[PDB]
Subunit: 310 residues, 4 copies
């Protein structure tokens, strides 16, 4: 039957007899996503990551379901005024890949939603929860089409934006990543700076000792695109720690965690090398994390080589 | 001032006091792109590159400006019935990258336009001209926005589709690629099969001898996106012959030739390793060709290593 | 603040802590509205009031909020299957004015929503309520822009569809009709059959006795266009009882009743001449009704003239 | 085969071996229509009022076409003389958003245009816009209704195009339209019946109460000229905005409302009169002068003109 994101969220929200605050929040995000999608298709005529930031910021503020908002674009967390204050914490990158938008390759919005756990007054620390605590997370990918991928406790669902009616149509129910993929994704230009484990794992994808087929390589350089491909076709994506960047480069709160959550809810894995990404407890909201995610056999096989190098 | 694609082609067409057949052909092409763009932003829905083929076929056949049409989706060249017959030959990929559209990564339309050179009755042979003979070429990239790249004798111009009004807006007049880039683009999964020249060139990009910065890596795997990025940012793109596809992989008539034409007309280069791409005289409509294209300094620096290897 | 139909409808439902079934009904209705609009902007291109009925029919059936559906296009009431059964009855014209769409004049969707009366099997009898029992009613007007007019207990609100984002933006909060207008609206070609009371009232509008300005005449003949203009500019709309048609022409259940409800909730009036439209108790789901509605001073002035005529 | 406005106009322009200045002008016009159509469908989500943008939209699209020298608009008191670098050979009279005082009620709005070729070799001036309607090269209207329709009348005839919003192309949906010989619908404001010229009261009375006791006509009046005329074209009948004694010259403007509708009507086999003459034969003395107009099906306008004769 015909399913929309807005119908989907109402059915499950009625099922659980919750107050509606999350359903309101998600509609607020999803309405913001359509706006960003619309501006991104004419992005150039007559900044853009600032429109996207203010759009999400204000649609979230006025949903009455948020108390603390963390954005890549703001130095400190945003504390909602008391009259509009609600029960959830939101971390989001409003336009990831906006530095690589001239080449018109994919850009995206990534979000993670937490519950405020304490009853203290809202502060920056309410966003410093571990990824395990995520209530809902996912991304909008503004590509050949606009797709919203929503991961929650029940699982991962893919909605396609139909611009003719401005509704997110359910196109992939409860998606589950392949156990093992045939594709690897990372920037090999920085091979000069690779941790030796990364060097060895990549060589094994290009030169298998067991004389099976070598893997293919893809790297758009936009995290939303690279991860979505890992989700849909299977494989491995790596933005790992090198010796210059000992904690990786991507941000934990609003890039690594929501992708780690989506992966895990699809049956995949997501690590820093040392632990699961979702078990890292943040002390800084803009802190970084290495990330290797994808099919469990591939993330495990990478972990097998990571173990070898001390 | 405000310029549209339809206006631009007519102004250059009026300037040359030509018959109007090419202007009609280009509008029939550009109208086709707008339909394809619509289809791609609304994909999924429970095959699509066949829509794109038949759209382009019928838009061209009824332009009265075409006589022989070569498409990736058809085994033989298409010979237009005489009542609609015209003076131009069109080679085209109606949806390049349509096998990687589940990942919502770029899809695109590539086209090459020849005036029929022989005076026989039209046949497949009329499509076997070399790229040097191209009158017009370019691509539509269905990405975060739909962008049309039109290369002609005067130079390269980029038009962005405005979806509110369905017009291609001029956003880049007389584009010129960077003299040298910082990005190389290829599938390194075929590393086991690389010609030593590609192997050495790639080694120089990751580990420079001159103690400069290594290049970055990008590879979408959809040729329109990689070429468009190379044009917009500079760098070098390679799909060389590996040991599996010894005559290269990309098609000469509608991938290599139109992209080589755009490169060269923007001050760049495009080679097979042995020669320039556009100087190759084709014998088969779906024949393949190795290709290395992009910035002149980068294409040249690769060619230096090709010489070194006999 | 920025308000959309979906955000507004969730807040009113949260405030009153209802089960959510009406909000789902309104959203399924709204999605049908957007779908109809898109088709109405491309009509003629190769009936349509059948697409709209099937569109509303299945959007409502699968809302899980309805049990009985009465349409202008189906002879009997439609009983929703028990798996999809809900507590509300909806009477609607899915595409009002579908006979005059060649002139690109307005078309519309009219709906009225009731609460199920029986606890038996839902049946046609559940649709035979008087207008007073209406939970919600209103119309979508597909004109120069698409407008949704939603009337509830709190009042009447007007929403404008933004097609770039496919969200209904609130543009008119708690609208109230002018006390007295300067425009009258009915078909004067049928003057031959007028009840003498109608003849006298209309003549008073062309030739005022008190030496005031004569009223203007407007008549689109599509009920959604005329009533909305009556709502927004004030005046009176008449499709009265003549002796040839003693029960009027428009259908009571899904044209007169929702329009009367919107009028009354907006500070206006709506009569059969003999009584209020919402006070008529229907005996047939397709029964007819005379209707005179609009600004209260004008309807009263008509009613005082109807009284004079025996 | 499947035809768009842009394909159609190029084919006819190549058939006639012309220079292209007219085709470019029409494309600049079509681009103006699509933009206005998009803005009208969002006529609420708020910087300047809409008819002021529409005027500037059409003004600058025509100026920068290199095909115009004189432009007459409802919103500008004098003709606008195009600067020489962008100067071309055509004159455009247009209403960029007709019916815009009644856009709040979402009833139809429209864009009306008539295009004349500059006749003199003098410097372009306001006088160049004073040609009569017969001299029209091209005219028609955009109706922004439930869908956006482009109606284009030329010497060969009248064609109706549908704006398809997914691709921004005007799709030809009605080739060489022809109005009914006789209709069953009349159109004018009967609120002003107290002020009717005596022939009008008689002709309307004949339509509500026919003497031959045939069927009475139905009445329709939107109050937007584009919609009222367009319904007349498609269904047949008669539209009237005639002269009363209070308004001896009618109300509508000749150069950019009456003339282009008269051209569309006549090229579609219809009629269009002031009562005293055919609309396209009036020789204008002021670019903003008014003219009465009665248009539509050939049989209906004639039955009116016969009543007009009885009255001196
Ligand atoms: C759909 C998301 C969701 C939202 C909420 S809630 O707190 O937002 N409540 C809520 O929306 N109630 C409503 N009542 C009437 C209407 Br109409 S919506 C509670 C649970 C879940 C959920 C998540 C995953 C699986 C299953 C359920
Ligand atoms: C723009 C494409 C083009 C088309 C043609 S043509 O053969 O199609 N003639 C043509 O269109 N004539 C017209 N007359 C009135 C109108 Br309006 S269009 C001839 C030359 C060029 C051209 C190409 C590159 C650089 C400069 C010009
Ligand atoms: C907006 C229409 C409406 C719907 C409903 S309801 O039965 O649909 N319940 C409902 O929506 N609950 C939800 N809780 C959380 C979320 Br998120 S939705 C109850 C009352 C009213 C209402 C009507 C008129 C005035 C004021 C309110
Ligand atoms: C609006 C169509 C039209 C345009 C012109 S023109 O002066 O604009 N020439 C013109 O466009 N030439 C071109 N050359 C290359 C290309 Br591609 S178009 C002349 C006559 C007619 C015409 C009008 C009515 C019926 C039949 C034809």
């Amino acid at each position: 039957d015909v399913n929309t994101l807005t119908r989907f969220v109402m059915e499950e929200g009625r099922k659980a007899r919750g107050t509606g605050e999350l359903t309101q929040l998600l509609n607020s995000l999803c309405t913001a996503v359509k706006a960003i999608s619309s501006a991104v298709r004419k992005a150039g005529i007559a900044k853009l990551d600032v429109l996207s930031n203010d759009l999400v910021m204000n649609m979230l503020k006025s949903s009455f379901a948020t108390c603390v908002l963390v954005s890549e674009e703001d130095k400190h967390a945003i504390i909602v005024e008391p009259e509009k204050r609600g029960k959830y914490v939101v971390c989001f990158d409003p336009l990831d890949g906006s530095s690589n938008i001239d080449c018109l390759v994919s850009v995206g919005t990534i979000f993670g939603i937490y519950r405020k756990k304490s009853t203290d007054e809202p502060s920056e620390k309410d966003a410093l929860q571990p990824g395990r605590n995520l209530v809902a997370a996912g991304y909008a990918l503004y590509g050949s089409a606009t797709m919203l991928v929503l991961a929650m406790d029940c699982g991962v669902n893919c909605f396609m934006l139909d611009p003719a009616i401005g509704e997110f149509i359910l196109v992939d129910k409860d998606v589950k990543i392949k156990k093992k993929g045939k594709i690897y994704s990372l920037n090999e230009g920085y091979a000069k700076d690779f941790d030796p484990a990364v060097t060895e794992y990549i060589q094994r994808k290009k030169f298998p000792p067991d004389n099976s087929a070598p893997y293919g390589a893809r790297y758009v350089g936009s995290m939303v695109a690279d991860v979505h491909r890992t989700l849909v076709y299977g494989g491995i994506f790596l933005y790992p720690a090198n010796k210059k960047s000992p904690n990786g480069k991507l941000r934990l709160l609003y890039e690594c965690n929501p992708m780690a959550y989506v992966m895990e809810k699809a049956g995949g894995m997501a690590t820093t090398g040392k632990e699961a990404v979702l078990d890292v407890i943040p002390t800084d909201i803009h802190q970084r994390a290495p990330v290797i995610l994808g099919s469990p056999d591939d993330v495990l096989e990478f972990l097998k080589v990571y173990e070898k190098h001390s």
